[PDB]
Design a binder for these strands. Structure first.
Lengths: 110, 142, 150, 56
RNA sequence: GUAACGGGGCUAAACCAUGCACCGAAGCUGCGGCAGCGACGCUUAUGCGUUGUUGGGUAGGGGAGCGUUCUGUAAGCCUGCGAAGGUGUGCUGUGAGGCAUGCUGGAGGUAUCAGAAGUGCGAAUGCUGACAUAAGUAACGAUAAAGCGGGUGAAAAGCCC
RNA sequence: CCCGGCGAGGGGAGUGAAAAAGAACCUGAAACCGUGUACGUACAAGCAGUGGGAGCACGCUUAGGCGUGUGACUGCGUACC
């Protein structure tokens, strides 16, 4: 039994979040939470909330035990980009992309 | 049917010992290159190393015809602006006698990863003694 | 195409391809390169060629036994039920009926039957003679066709 | 000043081979309170080496 | 930077003369297949028995076809026992292609023979939209300057005192 | 109902023929960006393919020695308009 939690349209580029995600892939949930706690990255806060939500879903919806859970799958997907205009010198205009991402965490008792 | 192809994990390689005393450098080198490539075997395959291990003794006693003993020049560039260095046949024999045969054989072998692998099977010694008795080399009068 | 004839940007100086009109067919929302106009597709047919084709069609219908000649063909009242019953007796379902005089009772009865058409001797056309499985022509109608074709 | 050819996705991945983060090797455990903490750092509750440093 | 045999090397593995072998091309021959043009059997509503010969190709000329949308044939035919489209697999023709079928999809599609074209895109510093690259790089807009305690808050270098 | 900041965003439940029709909503192609598995890759030089070809993995098979993916090594080979 595997439980899924997602955070779609997160305000962060997929590249930045992927750095944190690779730290906890395949680790036990208890160990993963400790790693995210002491990671000085904004993406760490976002990932931790998703992981905590996935753990809660397992208890309430699947009736699983936290001691047996681990991060079996975790990946970050690119989300829609917001277009903005940044004035430059000599009247030139530039396009600014505010990239977002979809964070998915899967926890299983395996 | 398809033409037979040699298998690198089932090819038989033998050990031979050759004495280079008094042998012409070029004529000796061609025979060594021929056997290192396996051209003398009916199972010869261009993309497989089917040659034999060869031990060369007395590499410092090779012979050269004409005035090549003092006129043959070995050039090599170090990669820097000055770079160009040279040494005659006499100088090479005094300093690094093994390089004389090794250089000649290398130029006679194919160029590429496989040709480099073939060169690994050649053992050249300046003296008359070798420490490969465990391999039981067979005397080769070449 | 609605729009102005102003040059979108100057000929030289910018790193863009030449532009002269916003209505160019290359551009999106531009005009059609060879925009169509209303036209007449009708073709001329020689009188003799048209008459010859009808004679060939009529001859073929006789050869294939698709042409039926009857003394008369009419109904008592302008009721579709009567006409449909009549065709069942003659084993006809998709037929073209040609009569010398276009009786109003017969015309009204066949109006709702989409497989049945009633025509006058002068109203025959080459396509109709081929489209319908069978053609029924009254004896007097047969006579009228002869002078038209001669 | 600028590239003459578009670098490949393969080259992009090679450059990022050194961008991976490193996780803390392990967390110290306070001798008195027993809570995990960064080594040589005070705990979230204000303890350090079981001395109960100011926690106001 | 050897740099006036491609290299290794060669006193023949150089040069001259003679002789016999062998290697060597999409040339020639052998085997199988396709097509064009000729004459022949007066064969045949013509394909062969055969039969010789030909088949590199730009500008360009001639000949024969594939597929797409639409009209008739069609109030027919296929289709919720799953249409078009999307995505795989197998088979098939000399080619443009065609046929069948798993999954997706959830309502249209269309034989045959004819008819008409907004009928086939990689390029035009082509047009519009989407998304890459450089790169997590430059930069965050006057070098007048900040430090600490308390409060509020999920969170305070930037807010309040 | 549950995690979360009485958020955003999700996991259940329920509705429905369908929720991978959930309003960023029919169908959902391509560029582009990811996770997993098989194989190759850290002494080897160039339009990245082609001809030959070992090994490994996997599906077959009355061992039928074939198919599929990968491609050590080797001959030839300087895109298109």
């Amino acid at each position: 039994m595997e439980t899924i939690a997602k955070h779609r349209h997160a305000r962060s580029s997929a590249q930045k979040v992927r750095l944190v995600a690779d730290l906890i892939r395949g680790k036990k949930v208890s160990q993963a939470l400790d790693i995210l706690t002491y990671t000085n990255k904004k993406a760490a806060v976002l990932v931790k909330k998703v992981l905590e939500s996935a753990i809660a879903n397992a208890e309430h919806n699947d009736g699983a035990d936290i001691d047996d859970l681990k991060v079996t799958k975790i990946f970050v997907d690119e989300g829609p980009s917001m277009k903005r205009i940044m004035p430059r010198a000599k009247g030139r205009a530039d396009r600014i992309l505010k990239r977002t991402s979809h964070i998915t965490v899967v926890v299983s008792d395996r | 049917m398809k033409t037979f192809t040699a298998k690198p994990e089932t090819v038989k390689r033998d050990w031979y010992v050759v004495d280079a005393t008094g042998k012409t450098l070029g004529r000796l080198a061609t025979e060594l290159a021929r056997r290192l490539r396996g051209k003398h075997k009916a199972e010869y395959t261009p993309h497989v190393d089917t040659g034999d291990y060869i031990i060369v003794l007395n590499a410092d006693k090779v012979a050269v015809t004409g005035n090549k003993r003092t006129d043959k020049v070995y050039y090599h560039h170090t990669g820097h602006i000055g770079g160009i260095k040279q040494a005659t046949f006499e100088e090479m024999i005094a300093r690094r006698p093994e390089r004389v045969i090794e250089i000649a054989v290398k130029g006679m072998l194919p160029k590429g990863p496989l040709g480099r692998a073939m060169f690994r099977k050649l053992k050249v010694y300046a003296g008359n003694e070798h420490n490969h008795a465990a391999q039981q080399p067979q005397v080769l009068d070449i | 195409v609605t729009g102005s004839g102003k040059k979108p940007w100057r000929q030289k100086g910018t790193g863009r391809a030449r532009s002269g009109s916003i209505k160019s067919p290359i551009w999106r929302s531009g005009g059609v390169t060879f925009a169509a106009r209303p036209q007449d597709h009708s073709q001329k047919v020689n009188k003799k060629m048209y008459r010859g084709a009808l004679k060939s069609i009529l001859s073929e219908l006789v050869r294939q036994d698709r042409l039926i000649v009857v003394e008369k063909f009419s109904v008592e009242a302008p009721k579709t039920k009567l006409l449909a019953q009549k065709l069942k007796d003659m084993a006809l379902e998709d037929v073209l009926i040609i009569t010398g005089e276009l009786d109003e009772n017969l015309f009204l009865a066949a109006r709702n039957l989409h497989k049945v058409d009633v025509r006058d001797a002068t109203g025959i056309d080459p396509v109709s003679l081929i489209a319908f499985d069978k053609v029924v022509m009254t004896a007097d109608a047969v006579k009228q066709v002869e002078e038209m074709l001669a | 000043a600028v590239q003459q050819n578009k670098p490949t996705r393969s080259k992009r991945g090679m450059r990022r081979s050194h961008d991976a983060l490193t996780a803390v090797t392990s967390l110290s455990v306070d001798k008195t309170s027993g809570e995990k903490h960064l080594r040589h750092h005070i705990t979230a509750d204000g303890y350090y080496r079981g001395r109960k440093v100011i926690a106001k």
